[PDB]
Amino acid sequence: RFLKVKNWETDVVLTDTLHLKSTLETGCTEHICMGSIMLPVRTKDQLFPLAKEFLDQYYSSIKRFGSKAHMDRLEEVNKEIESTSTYQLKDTELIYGAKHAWRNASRCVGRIQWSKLQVFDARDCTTAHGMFNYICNHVKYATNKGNLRSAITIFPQRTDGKHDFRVWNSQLIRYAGYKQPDGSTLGDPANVQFTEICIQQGWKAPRGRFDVLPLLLQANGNDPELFQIPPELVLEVPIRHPKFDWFKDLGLKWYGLPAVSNMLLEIGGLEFSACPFSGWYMGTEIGVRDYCDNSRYNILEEVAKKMDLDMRKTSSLWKDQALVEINIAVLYSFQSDKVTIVDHHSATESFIKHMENEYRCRGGCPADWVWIVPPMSGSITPVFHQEMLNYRLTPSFEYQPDPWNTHVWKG
Amino acid sequence: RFLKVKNWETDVVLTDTLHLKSTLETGCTEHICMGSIMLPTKDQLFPLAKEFLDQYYSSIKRFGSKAHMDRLEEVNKEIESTSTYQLKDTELIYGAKHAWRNASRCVGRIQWSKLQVFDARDCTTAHGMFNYICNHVKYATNKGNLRSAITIFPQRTDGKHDFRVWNSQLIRYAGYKQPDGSTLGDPANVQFTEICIQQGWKAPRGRFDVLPLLLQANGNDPELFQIPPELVLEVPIRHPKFDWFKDLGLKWYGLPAVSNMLLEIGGLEFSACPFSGWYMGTEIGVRDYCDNSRYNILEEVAKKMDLDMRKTSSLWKDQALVEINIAVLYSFQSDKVTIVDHHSATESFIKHMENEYRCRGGCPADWVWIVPPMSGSITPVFHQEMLNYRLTPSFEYQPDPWNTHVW
Numbered sequence: 001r002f003l004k005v006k007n008w009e010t011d012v013v014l015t016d017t018l019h020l021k022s023t024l025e026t027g028c029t030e031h032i033c034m035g036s037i038m039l040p041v042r043t044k045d046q047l048f049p050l051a052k053e054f055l056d057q058y059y060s061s062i063k064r065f066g067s068k069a070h071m072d073r074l075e076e077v078n079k080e081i082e083s084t085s086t087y088q089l090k091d092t093e094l095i096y097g098a099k100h101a102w103r104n105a106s107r108c109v110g111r112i113q114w115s116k117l118q119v120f121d122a123r124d125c126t127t128a129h130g131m132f133n134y135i136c137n138h139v140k141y142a143t144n145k146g147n148l149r150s151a152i153t154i155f156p157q158r159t160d161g162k163h164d165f166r167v168w169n170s171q172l173i174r175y176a177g178y179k180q181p182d183g184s185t186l187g188d189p190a191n192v193q194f195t196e197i198c199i200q201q202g203w204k205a206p207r208g209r210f211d212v213l214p215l216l217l218q219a220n221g222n223d224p225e226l227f228q229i230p231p232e233l234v235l236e237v238p239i240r241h242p243k244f245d246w247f248k249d250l251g252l253k254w255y256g257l258p259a260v261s262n263m264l265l266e267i268g269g270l271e272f273s274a275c276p277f278s279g280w281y282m283g284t285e286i287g288v289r290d291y292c293d294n295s296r297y298n299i300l301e302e303v304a305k306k307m308d309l310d311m312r313k314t315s316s317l318w319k320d321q322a323l324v325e326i327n328i329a330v331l332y333s334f335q336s337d338k339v340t341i342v343d344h345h346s347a348t349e350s351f352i353k354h355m356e357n358e359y360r361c362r363g364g365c366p367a368d369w370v371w372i373v374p375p376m377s378g379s380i381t382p383v384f385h386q387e388m389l390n391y392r393l394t395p396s397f398e399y400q401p402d403p404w405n406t407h408v409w410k411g
Numbered sequence: 412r413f414l415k416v417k418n419w420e421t422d423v424v425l426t427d428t429l430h431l432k433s434t435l436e437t438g439c440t441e442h443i444c445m446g447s448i449m450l451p452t453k454d455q456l457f458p459l460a461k462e463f464l465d466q467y468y469s470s471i472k473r474f475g476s477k478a479h480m481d482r483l484e485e486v487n488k489e490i491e492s493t494s495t496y497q498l499k500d501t502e503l504i505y506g507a508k509h510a511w512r513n514a515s516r517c518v519g520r521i522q523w524s525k526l527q528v529f530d531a532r533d534c535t536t537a538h539g540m541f542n543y544i545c546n547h548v549k550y551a552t553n554k555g556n557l558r559s560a561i562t563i564f565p566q567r568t569d570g571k572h573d574f575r576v577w578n579s580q581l582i583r584y585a586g587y588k589q590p591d592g593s594t595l596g597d598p599a600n601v602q603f604t605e606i607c608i609q610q611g612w613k614a615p616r617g618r619f620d621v622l623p624l625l626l627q628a629n630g631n632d633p634e635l636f637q638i639p640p641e642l643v644l645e646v647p648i649r650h651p652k653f654d655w656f657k658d659l660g661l662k663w664y665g666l667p668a669v670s671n672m673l674l675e676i677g678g679l680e681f682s683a684c685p686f687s688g689w690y691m692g693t694e695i696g697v698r699d700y701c702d703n704s705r706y707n708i709l710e711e712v713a714k715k716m717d718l719d720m721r722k723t724s725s726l727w728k729d730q731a732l733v734e735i736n737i738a739v740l741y742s743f744q745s746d747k748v749t750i751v752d753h754h755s756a757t758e759s760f761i762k763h764m765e766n767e768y769r770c771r772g773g774c775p776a777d778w779v780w781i782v783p784p785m786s787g788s789i790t791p792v793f794h795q796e797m798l799n800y801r802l803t804p805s806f807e808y809q810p811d812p813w814n815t816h817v818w
């Protein structure tokens with residue numbers, strides 16, 4: 001069965017056959033749509049189909065489907081599962097897997113870049129100090145003095161679920177938040193809980209508005225340990241505005257390297273619970289969400305006040321006005337310092353091109369509209385007008401519980 | 412199967428029980444979400460009637476009463492007999508208000524119960540439809556102090572005698588192709604406009620000509636009527652800061668009034684049920700004015716503002732967008748024509764959603780449509796999880812009549 005999607009701005013219709021390869025479920029039924037819900041130990045049994053299906057895809061992509069090399073590899077993984085109950089990926093398969101999990105990531109607007117991903121294999125890693133070393137090398141390599149490069153670092157896979165590698169940080173670089181006794185928050189409210197764990201674990205917190213958090217690293221199911229990323233490895237951009245000279249006096253900066261460290265990468269049924277990956281920012285992630293969400297830095301009022309907008313009624317659009325100026329400021333600061341960044345016009349347009357190309361070459365492109373459409377100026381971007389089909393392909397990135405919720409402490 | 416929704420901005424969690432009364436299907440399955448797709452006999456009729464009368468008599472606390480039973484009884488008699496049935500006024504009104512209450516794409520539902528319902532089931536000809544429509548327009552406009560209304564024409568019978576308003580809205584601007592190959596007026600109406608020309612409208616060929624109504628009674632061929640111009644309240648668009656704004660020559664109409672939808676109540680279908688409320692400013696300033704396939708004035712505005720249009724990354728589009736939208740709200744406000752901004756309207760929808768959770772056990776909502784087309788994440792609805800599902804009574808899409816009308 002074929003499925004059509006239409007662009008209501010251009011009238012282009014595409015046809016999706018790829019959804020036919022979909023495995024995991026959506027959360028939706030014929031009776032309820034769960035499309036705006038934020039979040040909607042494995043045996044030998046389930047594992048062989050999952051391996052087989054992955055290796056069939058791998059071998060197709062390399063035009064070697066059904067070859068002797070293909071059959072020997074199935075054969076080999078098969079024996080390895082039965083006798084050891086898991087199996088090891090070849091390097092080539094890990095690389096292909098990691099790229100595909102990004103390619104398959106339906107909430108990711110930046111997927112046009114999926115095939116240029118630097119894969120760092122850290123499956124020989126055994127300790128938290130070794131993890132720190134790997135993560136430093138990833139940061140320096142991805143940062144590349146501002147000319148950002150996509151990378152991912154892959155730590156050993158889950159075995160019995162009692163020996164998991166985890167990066168406790170949600171991103172490798174992120175600012176501390178501190179709840180004050182008066183109930184206000186200093187720094188980033190989104191990281192208060194994690195900041196507190198760090199403090200409990202022994203971090204001496206500077207207690208400023210922009211303190212880079214220590215890495216908190218768990219190897220092999222052991223208690224996690226703290227490490228401070230060398231500051232010279234943390235590229236930051238002071239935020240100023242091309243026309244408003246008081247803008248710099250707001251005291252804003254952000255880091256250059258967006259690097260998600262809390263997701264789980266699934267490849268042929270194997271689970272990589274620590275697999276930090278990084279790209280570069282779209283400007284609105286910082287300018288709209290990080291700065292202007294109410295539950296984040298929330299600078300809208302102070303910006304609008306300095307701009308002396310009429311703030312007595314919402315229908316002045318003072319919020320919307322301050323919002324644009326802040327986003328101009330973020331993109332200007334990053335460009336001026338030569339740190340890679342993309343605005344939401346350029347990103348979404350590239351994404352529409354990527355998506356059409358995917359339909360032509362691949363039979364589809366799973367996409368989550370709720371997430372792809374940017375958080376300002378929705379309908380003046382070509383994705384707002386694009387119908388999308390959301391389904392789940394593997395390899396994939398998945399959510400996993402926060403480790404402080406599940407970790408069995410040793411002491 | 413008892414479902415939670417969370418607001419990620421405020422941590423408020425609501426439990427939804429109402430979805431377990433979902434009738435119709437979503438287009439979604441466990442394998443594929445179709446959340447972003449624009450459009451995904453005697454036997455049938457009696458359950459539909461019963462399910463409807465059950466909620467009605469429940470709403471007035473006479474569930475299981477003699478009057479409830481008698482009524483189910485009577486409607487049963489009438490279906491077996493006449494193969495259809497007729498709503499009591501009281502049912503009709505409850506039905507219409509509930510179709511709006513159930514509209515998962517409508518951000519404006521906090522108003523749902525203050526809807527003035529005009530019963531036009533006695534209407535028989537197109538002139539009659541024109542009269543009813545003019546009264547609806549004048550009533551809802553109310554010299555700028557707008558009031559919600561719907562006017563309900565007779566229900567479908569054998570589908571050969573449908574009433575339909577051919578216009579998509581009661582009030583819209585015409586659309587014409589040039590030798591130029593560009594488009595004069597509103598490109599979204601080019602086709603309807605030529606049906607008007609080809610049915611005989613003398614078009615003035617301007618940028619903002621209010622189209623005529625094309626009314627179809629009892630399955631006959633539709634007829635043209637012009638709305639008395641004095642009933643069409645329009646607003647010249649100026650900016651409170653930019654004096655040149657006014658010379659763009661923009662105006663819009665005060666009355667948003669959708670006329671192409673099918674209203675379904677207890678199985679019965681009202682194929683002509685024009686309804687109206689008042690605009691949220693982004694509809695005109697973001698969609699009408701800035702969509703590429705609409706009036707698409709972003710470029711001209713940014714030019715007048717002398718923004719750097721060299722690089723997408725100056726955000727000149729975003730800048731001109733805010734200004735266009737400030738000007739819509741300002742103009743409507745200045746002329747005292749009811750309008751709501753996206754901040755105000757979404758904040759009110761969150762309040763409604765909470766009332767519905769508390770008093771009804773849920774509120775079907777379509778996030779894709781509820782979040783405004785600008786400044787999404789600065790409105791509280793962006794951070795609100797919504798469950799989308801289909802309750803009846805409902806408004807439904809229906810095929811454009813020119814594709815269906817045997818002339």
Ligand code: HEM
Pocket residue numbers: 102105107108109110111113117150151152277278279280281282285342347371397
């Ligand atoms: C190259 C630059 C990239 C850009 C501009 C980009 C853009 C984005 C943005 C804006 C989001 C939504 C973020 C949010 O609002 O929370 C996102 C989601 C995501 N991206 Fe990217 N992305 C990039 C690279 C990558 C890379 C390298 C990967 C993995 C290798 C990746 C995988 C994902 C995934 C898995 C999600 C969804 C996360 C979830 O479900 O929460 N992206 N992308």
Ligand code: HEM
Pocket residue numbers: 511514516517518519520522526559560561686687688689690691694751756780806
């Ligand atoms: C009081 C002012 C109202 C406001 C501000 C309002 C707001 C909106 C908006 C912004 C939309 C989406 C429209 C679009 O983007 O094309 C919408 C959809 C809708 N509203 Fe309203 N609404 C109002 C009154 C009404 C009334 C009176 C009814 C019916 C009695 C109604 C039923 C609907 C329906 C059925 C839809 C979605 C139709 C579709 O699937 O396209 N609304 N509402």
Ligand SMILES: CNCCN(C)c1cc(F)cc(CCc2cc(C)cc(N)n2)c1
Pocket residue numbers: 110170258259260262263277278279280281282285
């Ligand atoms: C609940 N979701 C919030 C945290 N999270 C799990 C997350 C995951 C991503 F893959 C991506 C992001 C966004 C950060 C990011 C990550 C990358 C790799 C590129 C880019 N431009 N931005 C967040």
Ligand SMILES: CNCCN(C)c1cc(F)cc(CCc2cc(C)cc(N)n2)c1
Pocket residue numbers: 519667668669671672686687688689690691694
């Ligand atoms: C692409 N959209 C499909 C067009 N369409 C059928 C439509 C239906 C509505 F209920 C409402 C609207 C929007 C117009 C409107 C209608 C009403 C009644 C109030 C209001 N503020 N705005 C369109």
Ligand SMILES: C[C@H](O)[C@H](O)[C@H]1CNc2nc(N)[nH]c(=O)c2N1
Pocket residue numbers: 036037038370371372419793794795796797
């Ligand atoms: C409730 C809702 O799904 C949630 O706010 C989503 C909406 N869309 C999003 N889109 C992006 N890219 N990132 C987000 O965090 C969210 N949050």
Ligand SMILES: C[C@H](O)[C@H](O)[C@H]1CNc2nc(N)[nH]c(=O)c2N1
Pocket residue numbers: 008384385386387388446447448449779780781
């Ligand atoms: C493809 C997508 O479903 C389509 O563009 C939708 C998006 N959200 C919308 N939201 C509203 N309120 N009105 C619309 O016309 C649309 N269009």
Ligand SMILES: [Zn+2]
Pocket residue numbers: 028032033034035439440443444445446
């Ligand atoms: Zn869905």
